[PDB]
Each structure stands twice: as C-alpha cells, then as structure tokens.
Design a protein around this ligand. Structure first.
Ligand SMILES: Nc1ccn([C@H]2C[C@H](O)[C@@H](COP(=O)(O)OP(=O)(O)OP(=O)(O)O)O2)c(=O)n1
Ligand SMILES: Nc1ccn([C@H]2C[C@H](O)[C@@H](COP(=O)(O)OP(=O)(O)OP(=O)(O)O)O2)c(=O)n1
Ligand SMILES: [Mg+2]
Ligand SMILES: [Mg+2]
Ligand SMILES: [Mg+2]
Ligand SMILES: [Mg+2]
Lengths: 373, 373
DNA sequence: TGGGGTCCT
DNA sequence: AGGACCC
DNA sequence: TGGGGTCCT
DNA sequence: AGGACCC
C-alpha cells in the first residue's frame, strides 16, 4: 500500500467550451465568458490575442476589440456538465475527487495493477506511453514504476477519449505518483493534451516553478508570509529552516508545505460524492440599501429550492452572507447560520422569514444551504 | 412515524456507587467522592446529613463532619462502568443515546409495538404498570397511548433489573413520549425507582418546575437572558412573545426553548456509538510557571495514548488547552488544534514536541485527542 | 475582481 | 463565525 | 467550582 | 477557536 498512480484531469477553458457547444457559431471566434465586469475565462482563439483569464472587460476588450462575450453568471449549465464529467470518470474507478467545477483526481493504482496482471510475460515489453513524457525523459521498460505510470497514461488517454466521445469535451490530463505532481504536470502541454511524470524528473518539474505561490496549497496568505522571511523560490523553501518555519506557520502549515516544496505529498484522493452545500450569490455593488434589498434574497431562494430539492437530500441548515464598502477591506463577508425548522424541511413563504430575521441580527448578497442528509 | 415511547435511564449517585462497589466497607456510611476541593457527588446516606452535590469539601465537612471521602479525579473506572451500562441498554434496542457518564436515552417505540402485536385480543386488558405513575393519574386501558407507555414502563423495569443483576448498579428510569419529558419525569422518585408520564399530566410536570433553568436545554446563559426580559416561570416563557424572543436569541434558540416550555420536543434519540473524543485534564491552580509546566503534558499523554489506542481508531487531531488567573473571568480557556502527523499516527517522543510547539504558539492544563477514524 | 465550493480552527 | 485555500 | 464530553457558529 | 449546554 505504498506507490501510487494518480491522474489529474483538467478541462480546457471550461465555461467557454460549454458556451461554444451551446452556440456553435461561437467556434473559431475569440470568445470570453463574462460575469459582471470580469472576463472569467476565454477560448484559446482569444488567448492568442492577449486575453488572459480573469481580465476585466476593459483590458480584455482593448487588448482585443474583436472579442465576443457571453454572460456566465448563471452556473447551472456548467455545474451540470461538471457532474457529467465526474460521473463518467467514476465509471473507470469509483474514487474521484473534484476540485472546482473542472478538475478531477482519480487514483488509478488498483486499475493499473489489474491491467498488469492480465498481461502475459511478453507483451509487457511492448507497453507504450500515451501522450507526452515530461522533460522528454527516456523510459526504462524494466522499471516497474515507469511501466505502471505508462499504463496509467493509457487509462488517461481512454478517459479523455470518452470525455470527448460521450460529452463532447476536451481536456488535459497528468499522470504522476501523487496528487501534487499529477496536477503540476497536467498543465505542461496546455491545450488538449496529456503528460506523464516519471520519478527521475520530479525535481526538474518542481524547480521549473517561478515562485512558491505556484505550489497548490500555498495561497495568497502563506505566500506573503514566506516572503517576509526571504523564501522566494521553491529551493529557498526546500532549504529553509524547519524550526523557524515550524514555528511561524504552526507545525501543520509548515511541515506540510515544506514537503510540497520537495514534490512529496501523501494526501489520498478522496471520494467527493454529492456536494456538502448549494449556494447562489448575487452581486450589485452599491445597490443594497439595507432594507430595500431583501427581494434579492427571495431571488436566490427560488433557484436554491429547486436545486436542493433535486439532489434529494434535504439541508438541515441555512446561511446568509454579505460584504460592505469604501476602502479595499481585502477580506470581509459576514454571516449568520441557523437550523432549518423541521416542518419547513418537508415551502417558500417561511424561509423568507427565517432569512429576514437572520437578515437583521445582521456590496453583495448570498444564500447557502448546507448540512445535507 | 409519530408518537413515541422513550425511556431515560439515570443512575444513582454514580461515582459513589462505583466506589461503594469497589470498597464494600464504604456501604451504609455517608460517602462523598472528592476531586480537588469539590465533593462532586455523595451516596444517599450522605445527602441525609445535608451534603449536596457539588459542595466544597469545607461546607460538606462542616455540614457533616462524619463524612468519608475518596478521590474521584481519575475517571477510568467510572468510564468503564459507564460503557458497560450503555452496552447493556443497547442490547434491548440498538439506538442508545448517552448524556454524561450516567444517563442514557433509548427509543423504545419499535420494541413496545412488537410486544403489543404479540398480545392476543384479551390479555391487553391485563397490561399493568411497573413503577409509579407521575401525578398519581388514573390509567385508561382503552387509551392506546396509555397502553404503550405502560408497556414501556415494563421494558424500563427489565432494563433496571438487568443493570442490577448484571452490573450491580441501581438507577432511576422515566418513561414519556419525548426525551425532554422522559428526563424530567425520571427524577420525580429519586432514589432507585421509576416513573411513567401519561399525556394528561404533561402540563402538571412542566409547571412543577420552579424556574426555566430547570428545563434541559436552557443553561446558565439563556437563563440570565430570559430573566432580563421578565421571563421567570415556565408559564412566563410559555406566554412570552415569539417575536420579541425570536429576535433576541435568534429564531433557533427561541423557537426551540419555547417549545420546551410547553413540554414539546421532537429531537430524535441519536446513536452515540464510540466517543468522538478522549481527553485528560490536570488541575493545579497557580502551579503552572509557564515552562516548568510541560511535564504535566507528558502525564496526560501517557494515559491518553493507552486509551485512544484501545478503542482502536486512531485520532487525526490533537489539542492543548489552558486557563489563567486573578479575578473571576467566569469563562476563559484557550486552545490550539493541530493535525497528528501521519507517521506519528501508526510513539510518545514526537507527540511531546507537537504539543510543546503547540504549547508556545500559545491555572490548569489538558490534552484532547479528537477526529477519530 | 465572479460565482461557486471544501475543510480547519 | 471566520479564515484559508482552490477553480 | 472537577473532570469529562457533544454539537454549533 | 470559542461558545453554549450537559452530567
Ligand atoms: N477564480 C476562478 C477560477 C476559475 N473559474 C471558473 C471559470 C473556468 O472556466 C473554470 C475552471 O477553472 P480553470 O483554472 O481551469 O480555467 P479554464 O478551464 O477555464 O482554463 P484552462 O483551459 O487554462 O484550464 O472555473 C472561476 O470562475 N473563478
Ligand atoms: N457537573 C457535574 C455533574 C456530574 N458529575 C459526575 C459525578 C456524578 O456521579 C455523575 C452523574 O451526574 P448526576 O447529576 O447524575 O449525579 P449523580 O448520579 O451522582 O446523582 P443522582 O443519584 O442525584 O442522579 O457525573 C460531575 O462530575 N460534574
Ligand atoms: Mg483548472
Ligand atoms: Mg481547466
Ligand atoms: Mg444524571
Ligand atoms: Mg445520576
């Protein structure tokens, strides 16, 4: 129960793919998906002209005035497609982990070994790779670990062909020995391709990063913190002092991110199953008076109710969130949780009141249904 | 799936019972179990002389200078007996809920109905009660609800006989239609007896209380809050305004405690199963220097390790707690959680360090192992 | 600088 | 409740 | 005023 | 993390 074969599957310009499938006339045209003033993502034709992900409409448009834009505020369709993709990956192997709407990890370890036991003592010399090999590294067919990672590159290719054939979506995959590597290597060949990482090239991959905020797990916060100590490259982090780090982020934050800086990462691929929550969010900077704005709350609920319904499970908690304005508070949402009266659980009318009263004990508003059962 | 038959089982002077079984020479002598300066509980011979639960050693001793005292700081034995009792109740019906070391709720609804279907259309006129009937109320053998509550009083009597015969422990039981009533009525006949609550006497029971802090669920906090509004008796609470209450404790705290004030309570008896946590706590007011005091931390761990071990499940988190001194801060413990390094999970040496470092990011100290799996 | 979503403390 | 991290 | 323990926000 | 509630 030690060496693993994990794949990370990461779809191409996901929202824009889904919009291009819905309206084919958007193909071959540079496309951006807008949400308020933000171009959240764009198709590859777009990125050729300079549009980057999370550009504002303005910069997007003055970098490329020929850009089509469609609204992506409503996530319904993306969320549906997102689950269609996870469910299809669950068929290859039950344990799939989601990350956002367009990433999935799958532990292919049991699958690879079953395939290897089916191959006679002869064809195993014919095992080939599918896709790119990170760093152009040579394969060694007598290396058991190379053989398992190639077999894993083949399962990957089959998952991508099925995603294409069955749902019409393209994507990249990365095959590696842990989740951190598999995700870092799935991006090496961007558009609709896959890459496999052999152990000998782990260090090359991790040292190819230009700053530790590129390591999955180190976010906006730890990043500035690590800086304050002089730690800027992944090597700085590798060689920095455990004690001084240990004692400045807590043994947890520290002992973990240091392992990552080496490419080491033992977290298991967890089963995501159905969501732990369902929320809708509306935005209207400056428009929320602070009484005239409740009707918005009934807006969110209308959809929420129909969604939560469907899954089936009924939520046993509700939550309401906000955010106020003037200077850049960087950080500042407020909320009030509350249990969903048991009668209310088995419709719209009351909810409004819970929320309204929940509203008073209290830029933008949202509603979350959690604690599903 | 509506009317229930629930029993609440509540053992007599639990710690002192266990001490009297271990040292029979303590029988018939007034006994108090001490923890530091507190007489946490005493046997009934004691309470005759004035010793009340949670009296200080002094008041206990000047109220009764003939009082034997044994130390009950180490809970090991009480905890063992506590699980022996729950496991024996689980045999009658799988769903047992614990509350503290000496209370258990059991939903006897399915059991009662199975027994009623086994009784021919004749002996059912002979169904009798076992124990006291709260308020001396008359039974009506044609009342299906009376019949089910009597059958439930019989299951209760059988559980108490088994607790006695199998583990040597006596206790009280209360049979009622929900958890709140079953617990309120289990105390009406204190020492080693049982009482059953028929629906017609619910109001009499609930109005027999002298203040709302006597209702399970209303604690030290809500109590003072309800006061601030004039709400003192259970009737005040019953008749107080939902809105003004709703909006002063939150719709949750309010809509719930108001139901309780009526005797209404729909919470289901939950399965407690194995514990969600294991902790040890040591006390030494004023003795913790704030470096000389870590050895204490290794004390707690020694036992913890052996305990957590046993259950089997390994904890995936550790926690360390404190509390400082001068004026009565009423309220004031501090803690720092931290994940238990995976290598450490499958021994003593490191733990100490996690705790020590956990100790520095930081009257008494403790260690908790949680997040079992 | 959107609209979601997960787990920890 | 709020924080941190991810897409 | 002990030494535990549970669930919520 | 801390709060509230229970034994
Ligand atoms: N901060 C973020 C990150 C992403 N997304 C949405 C828009 C994307 O379509 C989708 C997936 O995130 P990715 O980083 O994968 O972006 P893409 O799939 O769109 O692009 P790529 O093709 O570079 O993987 O999630 C978002 O709304 N907000
Ligand atoms: N604040 C509290 C409450 C109780 N206990 C311990 C000592 C008791 O023996 C046991 C059970 O609590 P009870 O209220 O049931 O007290 P008793 O069983 O001891 O007495 P009774 O016979 O009145 O039920 O838990 C405790 O240590 N601290
Ligand atoms: Mg992605
Ligand atoms: Mg993507
Ligand atoms: Mg009790
Ligand atoms: Mg008791």
């Amino acid at each position: 129960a030690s060496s693993r074969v994990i794949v990370h599957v990461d779809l191409d310009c996901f929202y824009a793919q889904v919009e291009m499938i819905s309206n084919p006339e958007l193909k071959d045209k540079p496309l951006g998906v807008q949400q308020k003033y933000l171009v959240v993502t764009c198709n590859y034709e777009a990125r050729k002209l300079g549009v980057k992900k999370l550009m504002n409409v303005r910069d997007a448009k003055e970098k490329c005035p020929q850009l089509v834009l469609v609204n992506g505020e409503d996530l319904t369709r993306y969320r549906e497609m997102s689950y269609k993709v996870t469910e299809l990956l669950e068929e290859f192997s039950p344990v799939v982990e989601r990350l956002g709407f367009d990433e999935n990890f799958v532990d292919l370890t049991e699958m690879v070994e079953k395939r290897l036991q089916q191959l006679q003592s002869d064809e195993l010399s014919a095992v080939t790779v599918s896709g790119h090999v990170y760093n152009n590294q040579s394969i060694n067919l007598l290396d058991v670990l190379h053989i398992r990672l190639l077999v894993g590159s083949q399962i990957a290719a089959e998952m991508r062909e099925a995603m294409y054939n069955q749902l019409g979506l393209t994507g990249c995959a990365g095959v590696a020995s842990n989740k951190l590597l598999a995700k870092l290597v799935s991006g090496v060949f961007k558009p609709n391709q896959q890459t496999v990482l052999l152990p000998e090239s782990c260090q090359h991959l991790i040292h190819s990063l230009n700053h530790i905020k590129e390591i999955p797990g180190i976010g906006y916060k730890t990043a500035k913190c690590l800086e304050a100590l002089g730690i800027n490259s992944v090597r700085d982090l590798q060689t920095f002092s455990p004690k001084i780090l240990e004692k400045e982020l807590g043994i947890s934050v520290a002992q973990r991110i240091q392992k990552l800086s080496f490419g080491e990462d033992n977290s298991p691929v967890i089963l995501s199953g159905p969501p732990q929550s369902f929320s809708e969010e509306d935005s209207f900077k400056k428009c929320s008076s602070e009484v005239e704005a409740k009707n918005k709350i009934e807006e969110l609920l209308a959809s929420l109710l129909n969604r939560v319904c469907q899954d089936g499970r009924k939520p046993h908690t509700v939550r309401l969130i906000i955010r106020r304005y003037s200077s850049e508070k960087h950080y500042g949402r407020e909320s009030r949780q509350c249990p969903i009266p048991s009668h209310v659980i088995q419709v719209m009318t009351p909810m409004v009141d819970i929320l309204m009263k929940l509203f008073r004990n209290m830029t933008l508003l949202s509603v979350c249904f959690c604690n599903l059962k």
